[PDB]
């Protein structure tokens, strides 16, 4: 026959032998007699306002759409589980990790970054890979990308970054001057620019790309003891990338390529997994790391910070409803359960704010009650009330102020954050000048071959070629800074294009 | 001790000996260590952005308020049951009335009409008495008033109506120029104004007033035979109104008088009931009733159209949470299940549209998924999908187009509406010169005594007095028009004020 | 250099020599000192909550996206003028057509129909061609399509229609089972499907397609004499469609092809025009036209109803800001100023309600105050007040009730609608067995050549092939029903695919 | 005649001799023929969906209401100006203050705190007194109360505070156990509890109460030099309070008493003013102040910190439209122009967040474009775009990322915040135990007479009397702590009530 993606209504149906379709209602639950024909006066007369069946149905239609995500708008989702396989309770007291063999339920959204909802899957762009964990200590979202780094070290530049990757305010086209003005103007961006215009540019679907946490977390054990960390969840299926030729065909042949695959995998029983490691850096090594340990354009070398196994991530269940389980899934960085905790990373620090800020806009004040966003494996008791589209019992008749004499929830000191020490001037510290090439240099010299560097160049100018020549000049100079061959390999190409 | 409203937290607690308070969490379900102290650098330093407990709880606060009801904003609610006590099966094939002794669950909100949410209960104003029934044919909402009539016969004059009962666009004050300007310029308004300024303008609480459907519905039996009707739900508690001096006192002394009283009755075992009655009008009697049978400023005389008993309405359960079961209740008149159906009543035809329309504004697109507004005694199966705050499973992976070869829901013929014939010009018919006094005149000579007649006169004039003399002059003509003594009993008094 | 879309920022700048950049502010207008570095304690400390510049700008970001159009989501817009060139005053008393040479301002958005916002321009889909006119009798919106007909005759089947053109509720993929399931089960759908899979299914850009009002309007002259009509706005640029091979290429190569092209034409002085024409049908010819004159799956033959010229539509100004003048444009069909008026067209009667309904959802309650949607060539005076984002002075302190003794606005009789007589049963008339093939048959024998006939066949089958065989079987019967060779030219090909 | 509040439509009218009311339109700007009569078929037929005049009007009605403020919901507003009268440029470099005789425009909202929109003006409760300044350096809102202190020192307790002052979640009544549980449980609250149950409990309208900034600001001069400050704006009309007897009559006689007065003042030309002083505390005095200088329950003694004149606040213009100019006014603490700047005050620090957070909910993402909320006297240029109900030109075609090579706005280093030094552990520092009585003690002994203390007691128990006796016990103990007579004067009363 055909791929399971395609046999969907077929199976929905096959599955009800215990048929006799339900009665077609209105949302008030009144049964409908005719839904193919509006109520008029005379077969050729006008539409009656008493066709409250028309308006019901129509009123709902006209309301189906919610704003799509500010970035990362286009994606795939799926459910499965995390299971412990080694223990790191030395490092962390978090339940999710509390005992080898332990299994917590998880949801996952894969996506691109710049493209809007009708875009094509198979495009050069970073790639979200977000995991929500319904632990007992509440949800723990770990909002990762498929890259360990990023383009910038200060959240304040984010809007601008994102703006320049999207569309001209006047034109509504993608604009290379904007792409290339930004980037060449902020060279802290060359590390990930270098990752992206590489073969890892475009993965072969979600199942053949790694996931990272990117940021530096803080892990705290049962004694109050702290260490910094890095999360890496590697593909059990391997890497596998799509040539740029392959990628263009699929953009038109199957703009939704990655939903299809993800779907079909799981469905045919071919469950993707990933192995979660952690890098660990003590506070003192932190004090000596030749770079700012909390700098998104930076990786921790694994000769120095070898990886430590933690458990697996198994993807084994397809959404029944895309809208309700994928369009509406809300991942908040700030959903850190006792034992995990953010570091001083500038980028992390504004994600603390931004996520729940746009969820309250896109989904609504109470988006945490949407089925899939509910810490269901835990017990929410607090003094927050009311708000639009308030679903549950609103916590009934329970005292709503704190503190009170009437047995309402009470805080639990064991969940205090880790005491830590800060001394400084409240000022705005430059970061544009931290080291912008070193790590880039090596990447280019020792992590990637010769074809790979011949390609990474071709792809770079192949896009760059359409900025104005100044932007070109600036850009290559920067590239030139990281390694002189990086630069004149690119300048030569640019020449022949130009 | 005290009355039960007052002992609430005291009972909420007495009720948990299996205490040991729950753990206080964020909305993500993550446990909190200190909810009395924000997170800072040093005890006199600034507030960290990292205090994602502060922003969780505050973020929820700053978002607790939804718009109040455009009208009837202030109210009380409660749950109970409707119980069939006579059969009207000849008249209607509706499930709710299917067999003597049947009980259907019902919710009810009482409310006043023009005050905004912190106003006083005990003001002269009409009173809302809505009844939502959860039937097997979905919900059936009977958005009645405690008056059998109203001020107007065209929904088109409603906005205006209410605009003038509210406050001034410039001042935010209540204005008698606006009240009396409108009412005097539209004397169809005499019928209900006479009802409004008599003893029943101020019910002693909610329990001592009648509920009226006011509009003329149409009943359809199992043979396709329709008849016109009017619903009356009379109080088993008796009429009882508070003197205007009594009301002044309590408006200041206890703004919530009515809420307190309903809570307390039911809390102590004194459950209000109302007997539901129907007047019936054949299609024949209707081609001959001397007035528009469908005119909301008219009643059907009880010697002509005797009241027939239908069942009883008992209230026997208070809300746990007011916000979630009384503020979020949405009654839509268009929620009529098979055997109940709207008449050509111009005021009713406008209500068909407005209730859901504002419900999608106030509450949200999918406000019918609010536990309390859910037709939970029926099963919802349709082609409506998606939309903000989509709570259900959103009907899974079931075909969302109609018709379809795949066993998704089907319309049911036994639910077609009742066939009626209309002939005429598509035009806008005046209804301003429909008879404005007859019924009024009678009302004032034979319905109200002499005490009352002096009383309705003082009350009226006591408010009329503050308009501009032009306005009185015209207010009084109108009055003079229903009965010369009505007119001049009032002038008598207005001269003495003026 | 390059095409003008591409030189935008370059020109935005060349355009300010009176430079010296403005001071960068918050939204409160407070000047910013560093917008590249957030505020922290020490250079590696945490982010202060005090960085109210971070939260200002990020808070705005996280809130940039409004819902996209439920349909016709992807588009292009532009401004220009409509110019009377013949008089039709006999037919219509509308101000817009009042006198030869009159120019009224107009806006226009082109769009496709089923793709979401990042889709490709050049797909086979119908094409939207909306025209908003700013007349002295307020706005008049002509929400046309580039097709004179459509797929259905009852708005009630619309949700379904579109649900099946979109993607699967479970998969998020496009499904041929859904496409062909519906279309085969509703053959009224043959008329437009035949139009859709022929050469004109893919216009070469926006400039080379015709605009059609599709529905039958009704024109009312200054004597009260009405007539039925249809609007045709033909391209002065000529027809021109891209081969399906050409389209594949560009869907990948330039998703925005159409936007780019419209921008560029107008940018370079090549201003598109379309000639507007009206077919007229007396009320008489309508009691005898052999079909429902008001049936959207039918055209009025041009030998019977010749096209009469009305004026010209020129586009001659591009947007400054796309979000604000193209994404926020709201066209409502019900915006018809005196002398234009809806017919009993069941599809049109449903559109009367849906456009404003979704506009209040997407944009907001008061979306008609959006500069671009404002009837700026008229003066708005009514009793509507308040509501979210109320921008105007909200009509000051002017009486907000009607009627009133205080000189607030008054209704104007010369604007009453046109009197028509309707007689019949309030019922729901089938329209499914209205004639589904005649016009179709002709269309395929005499309207389309032999090349085209082979072509519309391959195209059709090329997509049909992916449905379940049942579905083809039935798809093909239908086809067989309009012409035996239509039916079997297709089977011929489907057998060879299958 | 009557008070100007009352002659409002009268004057609106009087004012158009240049009458002939405007034409009554629809919002699209189409003229209306009949607005008193819906469109039906037959004078007694049903409502046509083509009455797009009905739905327009009605659609808007149903949308008029926006959520009211979370607190401070009920109030009055007015416009006028601030003028400099002494100079403090030693202290501050802020333009508003830049030169004696200087005048900046201002808006003001007076309000209560707990009561919802229909509440009564004349009630014991603190009183908002908020001033918005349209300076050249953007707006400067100074969100003050009519008290120099507050009930709490940590924002985290705010929701809970507010909750307990409102209504029981179950009951919806005001609950003294909740009021008195909170307060007695958190004694840091006795300073302001002492202010509130005093004669300053209920002012005689807005014009006879002082305004304070309450919080501690930071003032920075042109050299980078800093000092801490306190803003006091004293009534030029004097104090004047309403006995509690007076206050109850007015609650029913004229729930809107304070709007009326405020209105009438200004209208009759009786412009209220207030004199703005500043207290100043150097950083070293800060280091030695026997208390936490940044503690809301604390005042700076004026023998020690005598007041320094700054300018006047003159109120001389009434709103033309309440909704648009008072309901929609948004005051943000965070609207601090270069020269003014927040201190480490815990309460201030969460107001930085909360205000704009709930404005984006209640009014909308773009509430800064609402006429009255617009920094109109300044020039907004930034990189923020889009968002719902986006009014202006959206900044046209101007580069939207930063930094860029194309002359888009640039930041201005002279607006850097003041460098300052913080050293600490990131922890949550208790504050419940800071001194809770001292200042209270003196208040009670030396700021208020003997009648005043006899009253302050009577009012206290007069309310307290309705909590349970435990709450009573706790409470008086606390009162007892501040001074033993405070306590047994209250216990005696409580006795006689109980
Ligand atoms: C953590 C401490 C506080 C928090 C979080 C807080 C929060 C809020 C909120 C959410 C509103 C509603 C605003 C709107 O919808 O536009 C509000 C209004 C207001 N607050 Fe507070 N409040 C705090 C303490 C105080 C204090 C100490 C004062 C006086 C110094 C004050 C003065 C006001 C005033 C006057 C308003 C009314 C705004 C208006 O009149 O438009 N707050 N506050």
**CA-based nearest residue to C66, from A113, A116, B277:** A116
- Using the structure block, give the residue that is written with the tokens 């229903």: B482
Mutate: best of A20, A25, A267, partner B, most B CBs <10 A:
A25
**CA-based nearest residue to D429, from B44, A344, A426:** B44
Q: Rounded to an integer, what distance in angstroms lies between the CA atom of residue B130 and that of residue B111?
A: 9
State the CB neighbour count (10 A cutoff) for residue B447. Answer: 13
Order of strands across the sheet that contains D40-41 = A40-41, C421-427, B421-427, D40-41
Compute, in angstroms, the gap from residue D71 CA to the centroid of ligand 1: 7
Q: Give the count of alpha carbons within 13 A of A297, CB side only.
A: 26
- Would you call C8 and A170 a contact, using CB atoms and an 8 Å cutoff? yes
CB C138, CB C368: distance < 8 Å: no
Residues of C in contact with D24 (CB under 8 A): 381-382, 402, 409-412
Tokens at C1, concatenated:
């250099």
Each domain of chain B, given as residue ranges in start order, spans: 1-65, 66-149+201-374, 150-200+436-498
CA distance B102 to chain D (A): 30
CA distance C13 to chain D (A): 6
Q: Rounded to an integer, what distance in angstroms lies between the CA atom of residue A200 and that of residue B330?
A: 53
Which are the contacts of C495, defined by CB distance < 8 A and separation ≥ 6?
A: none
Chain D residue with CA closest to C361: the answer is D388
- Would you call D169 and A49 a contact, using CB atoms and an 8 Å cutoff? no
Q: Rounded to an integer, what distance in angstroms lies between the CA atom of residue C372 and that of residue B495?
A: 55
B311, burial (CB in 10 Å: exposed 0-12, middle 13-18, buried 19+): buried
Residues of C in contact with D336 (CB under 8 A): 30, 52
Q: Rounded to an integer, what distance in angstroms lies between the CA atom of residue B192 and that of residue B127?
A: 12
Active site annotation includes A436: no
D78, D117, D128, D144, best to mutate for ligand 1 pocket (most atoms within 8 Å of CB): D128
Residues of D in contact with B59 (CB under 8 A): 357
CA dist C323 → C75, C265, D394 (Å): 11, 20, 8
Residues of A in contact with D395 (CB under 8 A): 169
- Would you call B16 and A407 a contact, using CB atoms and an 8 Å cutoff? yes
Cα-Cα end-to-end distance for chain B: 50
CA dist C23 → A158, B384, C26, D140, D408 (Å): 20, 49, 10, 17, 9
Compute, in angstroms, the gap from residue C261 CA to the centroid of ligand 1: 52
- Would you call A424 and D424 a contact, using CB atoms and an 8 Å cutoff? no
Catalytic annotation, pick one of A145, A292, A373, A436? A145
For D35, the closest of C19, C60, C402 (CB atoms) is C402
Which are the contacts of D433, defined by CB distance < 8 A and separation ≥ 6?
A: none
Q: Rounded to an integer, what distance in angstroms lies between the CA atom of residue B385 and that of residue B364?
A: 14
Compute, in angstroms, the gap from residue A359 CA to the centroid of ligand 1: 24
Q: Rounded to an integer, what distance in angstroms lies between the CA atom of residue A89 and that of residue A105?
A: 20
Task: Give how far the C-alpha of residue A405 lies from the chain's centroid of Cα atoms, to the nearest Å.
Answer: 43
- DSSP assignment of B86-124 equals S--TTT---GGGSSTT-EEEEEEEEE-SS--TTS-SSSS
Element holding A438 (H helix, E strand):
helix A438-442
Tokens at D11, concatenated:
């004057």
Q: Is the CB of D109 under 6 A from ligand 1?
A: yes
CB A37, CB C139: distance < 8 Å: no
Q: Is B198 left (phi over 0), alpha (psi -120 to 50) or beta?
A: beta
Q: Is the CB of D492 under 6 A from ligand 1?
A: no
R_g (Cα) of chain D, nearest Å = 26
CA distance D44 to chain B (A): 6
For C320, the closest of A66, A170, A428 (CB atoms) is A170
Q: Rounded to an integer, what distance in angstroms lies between the CA atom of residue B478 and that of residue D125?
A: 45
Q: Is the CB of D334 under 6 A from ligand 1?
A: no
Q: Is the CB of D330 under 6 A from ligand 1?
A: yes
Catalytic annotation, pick one of B1, B30, B60, B72? B72
Give, as one character, the DSSP assignment of residue A101. T
Element holding A340 (H helix, E strand):
strand A340-342
Q: Is D101 left (phi over 0), alpha (psi -120 to 50) or beta?
A: left
**CA-based nearest residue to C220, from C356, C385, C65, C92:** C92
Give, as one character, the DSSP assignment of residue A319. -
DSSP SS3 for B493 = helix
CA dist D347 → B36, D358, D387 (Å): 13, 17, 30
R_g (Cα) of chain B, nearest Å = 26
Mutate: best of B1, B2, B6, partner D, most D CBs <10 A:
B6
Which are the contacts of D352, defined by CB distance < 8 A and separation ≥ 6?
A: B47, C49, C50, C52, C55, D333, D334, D342
Give, as one character, the DSSP assignment of residue B202. S
Catalytically active residues of C, by annotation: 72, 145
Q: Is the CB of D100 under 6 A from ligand 1?
A: no
Residues of D in contact with C369 (CB under 8 A): 391
CATH architecture of C1-65: Irregular (4.10)
Q: Is the CB of D70 under 6 A from ligand 1?
A: yes
Q: Rounded to an integer, what distance in angstroms lies between the CA atom of residue B146 and that of residue B116?
A: 19
Residues of B in contact with A349 (CB under 8 A): 49-50
A28, burial (CB in 10 Å: exposed 0-12, middle 13-18, buried 19+): buried
CB C25, CB D378: distance < 8 Å: yes
Q: Is the CB of D297 under 6 A from ligand 1?
A: no
**Does the domain spanning D66-149+201-374 belong to CATH 3.20.20.80?**
no
Q: Please tell me which chains touch B, using 3 or more CB pairs under 8 Å as the contact test.
A: A, C, D
CB D49, CB A46: distance < 8 Å: yes
Residues of C in contact with D323 (CB under 8 A): 385-386, 390, 394
CB B115, CB D117: distance < 8 Å: no
Alpha helices in C65-131 (DSSP H): none
CB B311, CB B97: distance < 8 Å: yes
State the CB neighbour count (10 A cutoff) for residue D425. Answer: 17
Give, as one character, the DSSP assignment of residue D68. P
Q: Rounded to an integer, what distance in angstroms lies between the CA atom of residue C246 and that of residue C243?
A: 5
CA distance A344 to chain B (A): 9
Q: Whose CA is nearest to atom 40 of ligand 1?
A: D109
Q: Whose CA is nearest to atom 30 of ligand 1?
A: D144
DSSP SS3 for B492 = helix
Query: What is chain A's length?
Result: 498
- DSSP assignment of C200-261 equals GGSBSSSTTS-EE--S-EEEE-TTS-EEEEEEEEEESS---B--HHHHHHHHHH-TTHHHHH
Give, as one character, the DSSP assignment of residue D30. P
Q: Is the CB of D216 under 6 A from ligand 1?
A: no
Tokens at D273, concatenated:
């003013």
D66, D69, D195, D348, best to mutate for ligand 1 pocket (most atoms within 8 Å of CB): D69
Give, as one character, the DSSP assignment of residue B86. S
Q: Experimental method for this entry?
A: X-ray
β partners of residue A273 = A314
Dihedral angle computed from the Cα positions of residues D14, D16, D22 and D24, in that order, rounded to the nearest 10 degrees: -20
Q: Is the CB of D111 under 6 A from ligand 1?
A: yes
Q: Give the count of alpha carbons within 13 A of A160, CB side only.
A: 27
Q: Rounded to an integer, what distance in angstroms lies between the CA atom of residue C219 and that of residue C140?
A: 13
Q: Rounded to an integer, what distance in angstroms lies between the CA atom of residue A375 and that of residue A104?
A: 12
Compute, in angstroms, the gap from residue D331 CA to the centroid of ligand 1: 9
CB A298, CB A264: distance < 8 Å: no
Tokens at B130, concatenated:
């809505």
- Would you call B426 and C426 a contact, using CB atoms and an 8 Å cutoff? no
Tokens at A308, concatenated:
């430590």
CA distance C137 to chain B (A): 21
Catalytically active residues of D, by annotation: 72, 145
Chain D residue with CA closest to A46: the answer is D48
**CA-based nearest residue to C176, from C456, C454, C475:** C475
Q: Rounded to an integer, what distance in angstroms lies between the CA atom of residue A223 and that of residue B32?
A: 18
CATH number of C150-200+436-498: 1.20.1370.60
Q: Please give the resolution of this entry in Å, rounded to 1 decimal.
A: 2.5
Rounded (5°) CA angle A168-A170-A171:
65
CB A402, CB B35: distance < 8 Å: yes
Tokens at A333, concatenated:
């960085």
DSSP SS3 for D150 = coil
Dihedrals φ, ψ of B109, to 5°? -120, 140
Q: Is the CB of D145 under 6 A from ligand 1?
A: yes
**CA-based nearest residue to A188, from A471, A469, A430, A382:** A430
Q: Whose CA is nearest to atom 27 of ligand 1?
A: D150
Q: Rounded to an integer, what distance in angstroms lies between the CA atom of residue D286 and that of residue D305?
A: 12
For A350, the closest of C36, C47, C350 (CB atoms) is C47
C469, burial (CB in 10 Å: exposed 0-12, middle 13-18, buried 19+): exposed
Give, as one character, the DSSP assignment of residue B447. I
CB D188, CB D154: distance < 8 Å: no
Sign of CA dihedral B428, B429, B431, B433: positive
Chain A residue with CA closest to B408: the answer is A21
Q: Give the count of alpha carbons within 13 A of A173, CB side only.
A: 24
Element holding D212 (H helix, E strand):
strand D211-220
- Would you call B40 and D346 a contact, using CB atoms and an 8 Å cutoff? yes
- Would you call D365 and C60 a contact, using CB atoms and an 8 Å cutoff? yes
Dihedrals φ, ψ of C170, to 5°? -95, -45
Dihedrals φ, ψ of D44, to 5°? -135, 30
Q: Rounded to an integer, what distance in angstroms lies between the CA atom of residue B48 and that of residue C247?
A: 54
**CA-based nearest residue to D100, from D90, D112, D88:** D88
Q: Is the CB of D359 under 6 A from ligand 1?
A: yes
- Using the structure block, give the residue that is written with the tokens 């082109």: C110
């Amino acid at each position: 026959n055909r791929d399971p993606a395609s046999d969907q209504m077929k199976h929905w149906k096959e599955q009800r032998a215990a048929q006799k379709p339900d009665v077609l209602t209105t949302g008030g639950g009144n049964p409908v007699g005719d839904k193919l024909n509006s109520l008029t006066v005379g077969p050729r007369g006008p539409l009656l306002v008493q066709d409250v069946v028309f308006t019901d149905e129509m009123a709902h239609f006209d309301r189906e759409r919610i704003p799509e995500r500010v970035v990362h708008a286009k994606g795939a989702g799926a459910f499965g589980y995390f299971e412990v396989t080694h223990d790191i309770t030395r490092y962390s007291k978090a339940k999710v990790f509390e005992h080898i063999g332990k299994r917590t339920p998880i949801a996952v959204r894969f996506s691109t970054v710049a493209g809007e909802s009708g875009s094509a899957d198979t495009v050069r762009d970073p790639r979200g890979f977000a995991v929500k964990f319904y632990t007992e200590d509440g949800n723990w979202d770990l909002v990762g990308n498929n890259t360990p780094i990023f383009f910038i070290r200060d959240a304040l530049l984010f809007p601008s970054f994102i703006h320049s990757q999207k569309r001209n305010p006047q034109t509504h086209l993608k604009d290379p001057d904007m792409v290339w003005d930004f980037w060449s103007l902020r060279p802290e961006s060359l590390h990930q620019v270098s990752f992206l215009f590489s073969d890892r540019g475009i993965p072969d679907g979600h199942r053949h790309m790694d996931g990272y946490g990117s940021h530096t977390f803080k892990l705290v054990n049962a004694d109050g003891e702290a260490v910094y960390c890095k999360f890496h969840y590697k593909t059990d299926q391997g890497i596998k990338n799509l040539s740029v030729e392959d990628a263009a065909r699929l953009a038109h042949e199957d703009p939704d390529y990655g939903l299809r695959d993800l779907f079909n995998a799981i469905a045919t029983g071919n469950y993707p997994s990933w192995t979660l490691y952690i890098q660990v850096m003590t506070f003192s090594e932190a004090e000596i790391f030749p770079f700012n340990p909390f700098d998104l354009t930076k990786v921790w070398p694994h000769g120095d910070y070898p990886l430590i196994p933690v458990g697996k991530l198994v993807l084994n269940r397809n959404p029944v409803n895309y809208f309700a389980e994928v369009e509406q899934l809300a991942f908040d960085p700030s959903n850190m359960p006792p034992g995990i905790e953010p570091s001083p990373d500038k980028m992390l620090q504004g994600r603390l704010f931004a996520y729940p800020d746009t969820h309250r806009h896109r989904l609504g004040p109470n988006y945490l009650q949407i089925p899939v966003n509910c810490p269901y494996r835990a017990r929410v008791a607090n003094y927050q009330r009311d708000g639009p589209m308030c679903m549950m019992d609103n916590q009934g008749g329970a005292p709503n102020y704190y503190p009170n004499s009437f047995s309402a929830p009470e805080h639990q000191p064991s969940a205090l954050e880790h005491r830590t020490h800060f001394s400084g001037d409240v000022q705005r510290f430059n970061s544009a000048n931290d080291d912008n090439v070193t790590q880039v240099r090596t990447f280019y010299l020792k992590v990637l071959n010769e074809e790979q560097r011949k390609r990474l160049c071709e792809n770079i100018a192949g896009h760059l070629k359409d900025a104005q020549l100044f932007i070109q000049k600036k850009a290559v100079k920067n590239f030139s800074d990281v390694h002189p061959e990086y630069g004149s390999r690119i300048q030569a190409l640019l020449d022949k294009y130009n």
